Amino acid sequence: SRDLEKHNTAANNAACAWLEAQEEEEVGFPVTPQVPLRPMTYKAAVDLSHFLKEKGGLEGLIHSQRRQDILDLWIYHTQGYFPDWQNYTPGPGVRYPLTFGWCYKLVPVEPDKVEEANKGENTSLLHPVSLHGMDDPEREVLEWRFDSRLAFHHVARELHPEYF
């Protein structure tokens, strides 16, 4: 295989149109890769999953579109991995990672705990736990959770084979 030419670009590849639109002054760090541009592999995804879980960065974190975006951006900036990789299965329920080796799923939060997080009138209005699935097409409050079985079982393909 090759190393990236029109084949995509900003008018036919969704990540390109979204990557070329991000401004460095808006995110907080340069949007240019430090490591030469390279794709995400199995080993890189597993290593990154363990790095993110073991030190309390992503585990138990409530999902946000902003959050996902800057995770893509920070990993692309610090590692050179192109944001083609952090996709999850549609439909209500658990979202499994389409990338085999990325050991992170999105589980929905129980409505009782969601309401117990929005109790009290001092809660910030634009917090991810305050959005009630605003960033979700199925309007679910999602949460990042690590799973070891995702490294050996490609649950995404097995459930929804149509993408591959």
């Binding site: 295989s1 090759r2 190393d3 990236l4 030419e5 084949h7 995509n8 590849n13 990540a15 390109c16 541009l37 390279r38 794709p39 995400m40 592999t41 199995y42 995804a45 192109f82 083609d84 990789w85 996709n87 389409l98 990338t99 085999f100 080796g101 990325w102 490609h154 995404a156 393909r157 591959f164």
Partner: peptide
């Protein structure tokens, strides 16, 4: 030897 990724990464190699 990359993963179950989108198109762009398929362009990079494998």
């Amino acid at each position: 030897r990359m993963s179950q990724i989108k198109r762009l990464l398929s362009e990079k190699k494998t």
